[PDB]
Amino acid sequence: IARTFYDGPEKNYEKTMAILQIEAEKAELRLKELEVRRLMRARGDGPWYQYPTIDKALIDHSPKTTPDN
Amino acid sequence: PDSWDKDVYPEPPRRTPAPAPQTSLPNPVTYLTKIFDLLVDRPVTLAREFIEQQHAKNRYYYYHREFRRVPDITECEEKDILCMFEAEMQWRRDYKVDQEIVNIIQERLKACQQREGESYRQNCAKELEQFTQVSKAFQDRYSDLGAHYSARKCLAKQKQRMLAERKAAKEAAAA
């Protein structure tokens, strides 16, 4: 029965080791992502949570018919 | 027989008295034992001889698995999952072996009680002492872990016990 239907215990051992490693990395990545999102929403200096401003190319730098401006 | 080891399961040398009849009446149990022998013990012995002859023509071996030694939970980093998994597996194996040791001691105690007849209270109190020591150690190891036990919980319980022992020793040294 063992020869025909099942395998050795080392197979399951190493499989669950790999599964545990994968899940641990995923958990760490999730926590790091939450922290990064919080920090970049608070500060706004990151790529995410960038809100549009007024483009400076719309300004007209020419004489305005009055000397002051 | 030769199956089990005589030191793990010890027994007294089995002193038995000789028959010293004092009557001329035919003892019936001797005749019944002889009849039972001649009528039952020989056919079963022949059948066992035949079965062992068949077994001897095809013999194969199975080997007892031997496990390596891996780092335990005390030298395991807090968030290193692989080492914790290895330590947990080793701790579970040790727990099972410990339970089987307790089982062996309990079997010794039961043989103690049954074999010594009426004077069991005195003859084999050594087995009682051995079982007391073994049970106390097993209790101090795995008493109150409860369900969902782990190596970390056992380590925490041991740390609490050592802290209590250290405090008691320090207080006693101040007497």
Ligand SMILES: CCCCCCCCCCCCCCCCC[C@@H](O)O[C@H](CO[C@H](O)CCCCCCCCCCCCCCC)COP(=O)(O)OCC[N+](C)(C)C
């Ligand atoms: C010897 C006689 C006296 C003792 C009798 C013992 C009785 C045992 C037979 C009963 C079988 C129980 C069913 C369990 C099936 C397990 C299915 C699965 O686990 O098997 C897979 C494969 O399946 C097996 O090949 C068996 C499949 C056969 C299904 C059984 C159904 C038979 C029922 C009879 C039906 C009759 C129909 C009649 C029509 C009219 C294994 O996956 P795999 O990853 O690959 O192999 C891993 C091991 N390796 C790598 C070493 C190879």
